[PDB]
Assembly symmetry: D3
Homo-oligomer: 240 residues x 6
């Protein structure tokens, strides 16, 4: 089956930043798989920590259930490496774990975080894991005999503060046809209504910009979009 991979540093990230891309490609017949490296239990769970008698285990449970609910709505499978956030740290074993996901999923493309992020050190680490694991999975000397990975395009989805991250979308994905799914997944992020609104505005802004880049008087109905920054040059037979 056609497949693709999302590598999310914290469990909520794939929902804010990749929900549209996931739902859209699922409807195109893709087996979308999400790896959440951590749950954002320490640094992306303020509401929970403000309740009494909170624990990391309790936070992880709440985050896990939200992610599974969102994944179901979007049409993706999801797994949890649970390696911890703030700080997130990985070793060779994390890397090989992720390379094995690549070997199993054989994704056509990969979505992860920007390589710079002055607001969150965990985010670029996730993308570095995603990229290096991809290359390990290409090596005929890694678990010899296994089917190797090819060269799936890798993209950074939109960070919270794109210019501060030196991130530029060179690719707009029109997610207008699946906005309802992305927003329903967004609503699984309990207690984070301000972010619901923020990422709604993001999709609308990128929607207008995407429309501008196909011609402002075009009849195409581009209302919601996700911006992506490509890691690799694309290969094509047509320049339109």
């Amino acid at each position: 089956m056609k497949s693709a991979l999302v590598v999310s540093a914290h469990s909520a990230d794939f929902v804010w930043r990749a929900g549209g891309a996931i739902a859209l490609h699922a409807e195109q017949g893709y087996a979308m798989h999400v790896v959440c490296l951590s749950f954002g239990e320490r640094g992306e769970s303020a509401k929970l920590w403000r309740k009494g008698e909170m624990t990391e285990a309790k936070v992880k449970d709440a985050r896990r259930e939200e992610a599974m609910a969102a994944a179901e709505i979007l049409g993706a499978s999801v797994e949890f490496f649970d390696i911890g956030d703030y700080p997130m740290r990985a070793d060779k074993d994390t890397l090989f774990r992720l390379a094995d996901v690549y070997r199993r999923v054989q994704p056509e493309f990969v979505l992860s975080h920007s390589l710079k992020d002055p607001y969150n050190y965990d985010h670029p680490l996730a993308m570095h894991l995603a990229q290096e694991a991809r290359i390990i999975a290409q090596a005929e000397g890694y678990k010899p005999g296994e089917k190797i990975v090819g060269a799936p395009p890798v993209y950074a989805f939109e960070p919270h503060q794109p210019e501060q991250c030196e991130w530029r979308p060179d690719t707009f994905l029109d997610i207008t046809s699946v906005w309802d799914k992305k927003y329903a997944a967004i609503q699984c992020m309990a207690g984070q209504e301000h972010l619901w609104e923020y990422y709604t505005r993001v999709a609308l802004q990128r929607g207008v910009q995407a429309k501008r880049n196909v011609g402002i008087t075009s009849a195409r109905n581009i209302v919601y979009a996700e911006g992506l920054q490509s890691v690799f040059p694309r290969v094509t037979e047509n320049l339109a």
Copy 2:
């Protein structure tokens, strides 16, 4: 009819740098049109100037005939603004001339030079003309009532010294199926065999790199490629 536009600073440039793209899209049913802003009569015609009793008029004639022969082979139409090279200079009238080409051709995409070039000031000027004329042609206040231009992608094709020009190909066009046409067009560039060889090596190098970026063990037969740098973000519904 489907159409596209190449803006060449000097008459030979579209052959070295865009021959593949022209021949490839022509076979896809595109009316490919080339504008040569000048003939490279002063700065790209050393062999001719080394003959006796040479004149700019004589050089232009030789360059014009070569370009027309190459265009015929590639399957493009070509016109000559004849505004002079070394130095190439343009005014509002040049700009409007080019905007009118846009309005007539209604291209789906545009190819021109890199925006930096420490070896040739004429080259970025050509691309600035191409880009600004494109925007003029978008304006409903420019020749009101005429059909406006949309937002065709613009690409810089490969300069002679790409790294010195700070140029990076983010797009590889597989021109393997039309290499014979590009090379036959190249052979119209009389007396420039060293450049024939140089741009053959360029296509082979980009071919290997393009192949690497689809997976080195892929069965795709990518032997010759042209590298392009995109000016604008592309809009799509699929990330593969």
Copy 3:
């Protein structure tokens, strides 16, 4: 009196991009002055051109009245160089005209466009005029005997597509206290409701980002902000 200057390529630009900054500093006792180099009569007036029997003179009249109405609401004075858009072109005389505005206004700071803009060549030209005129006005050899200009900070306000323009806000101006004025000025931009909504979303997005950069749990009520990119290093006695 304390004063400051906005240099707008087209008459509507200072409203979308600087309305907050204008209204905010006016309330601080600044004589805010706006120069509109053109009216955007050819490239920023599509609605008007779609009416019958439209002329540039008629478009300019409509644009002029809108700008004057917006300026009144924001608390700024405004003048119109009327040098034409799409393409906007300037000569030494335009430059000296603007240098004379500097000499008269003696602004404490200047707002204008980003220095790159792949969607609009007029915009960077406006900022280059603003910057060079500022330097001319510094010269004791320019109209000797006149009081020279000092070194007012210069900022680029937010372009429509900030990342494509390689623009990063290094400064957020909290305009929460004057949002009603900016929005009322925005409503003077007749027939452009989609842009009303776009720049409302911009202010809300920058508002959230500005809040993030003072501490997400801070009691400061930062709801609407404008992002600016500084041209020059600032000089201070305190780093908080």
Copy 4:
């Protein structure tokens, strides 16, 4: 009390690069705290190693006494993590140590090294520690119940070879009023007279440049300055 933090890779760095900023803010009522991650015992102590029978313990003692003397003169407190230089290496525990300093000091701003430095790998590591520890200290899941850190601005002070480090000062701090203190602290750096002279020239050069950026004919008496590069966008209500 108002407070601020300096993170110095080696014990002498805060004296050369931040002495002015420390003395200046101390006089403004700031409790200035300095963390020296190491003493520069192996790579910034050549004079000592040229004496006979030298040891790292002896070097550290000499460096510690100098730093304490300088801190006293500048009006700062100082602590020593003693994690070793050339190479400096940190782990999660170093990170948490520093996050605890943040939680205790609650600094209004942070000064540390440039993020690139081809002459000293320890320097960017110090700044990465400073930045990541700051973010850990923001997390309500890190030592839950403790008062979290907000968003204090972070600045890179001037490296020895600023252009090679790709460092640009976007902020000049006028330290004219405390130059005598900075220079007295500098003189605690025993045997390093060439560096005394170098960083005197640095302050004078930045002084002239800062003066240029407030207007060369301004009456402001800016003689000595420190240049800083900001990590985050600042938030303000005034653009002068």
Copy 5:
């Protein structure tokens, strides 16, 4: 004796990327030394892994023999750290191992990989090791009493995809006089004829570009060149 150092991530890299530089300086009386950090046994040995009953030990043996044969042809000595590729990882001990090579060889210059490489994470690690070990070897506190290293220039030799690596050659080394040696060394890379051809084309392309940068009508016979990117500013008494 005059000496210089090449730090190669995988055993084959110094042959493709530095063979010319090695052979050329050897003929100038340099003791050229190569450190191969790994053999590229897992990620640069596909042909071998496609044979039956292959092992990492067997791959390393084959790679070692090739490297020794190439080194002999080029006129260099070579040693093998054998720390493993895909992923290559280093610790303080690797670093000190390399610093000791510096102390022993006292190289006049160093060649290693580009600092970015989206196709191979091992490559920048090698260059970071090379650079940091160089600085450790400068420290009078590292193995006190030993002769320290000065400031040998460091260069990144050409990566497979230079623009994707953001690599620009600021230095061309004319290797025309030793091309036969480089190519004979290249032929030791058994079964990799496509790469023989690729790096032949690279040398020819850089040859043409180097010739262009000394004057296209110069009598200098520059046919084969290697491109290098310098890490540090060079110091000279002549600007020709």
Copy 6:
């Protein structure tokens, strides 16, 4: 004879920024030629404008005499295009004038201003003239029959605020042996003692940095240096 060229936007610039390079190469047997495009009569002559009854003609006379005196001391010839400063503007004729200087001088290298300068628009214009005129002079179609120019290296000498200009010295010229000449030339810049001191400090700072880049314990006596940024890749047979 060996020769080289300096293109100075204003008459004083070659003294502050290139005096060392001029004196040093003159002693190596170079015929050093300086073109001053203007006298800096309007924007670099404040002291004169503060006297009574000043005129541009009077300022130009004073500037001309200073430049001629400095040139004599440094060992260069100098000519004055007198095209005006603040604003400096050039046309095709200026360009051809400069190309003719190239054809006559046949320089081995060229020194001019940085390509960015937010403090002075005239400076980059001078460098653009220098670069484009160089290329015109290469063209066998420009004044056919004349001896063409080859590919002399072009360098930007140090601007007043290097980091704000995004300028990095990749080349340090040791001018220790001619500092007395540069300083004597500097003293011809009547009434500008603050700049005498500034550019003395610049040379001392670059001197220390150049020394650092040959090894801090080297016996080389590098006290005064000029920093240069190269436009083109250099071609060499040795990497030390």
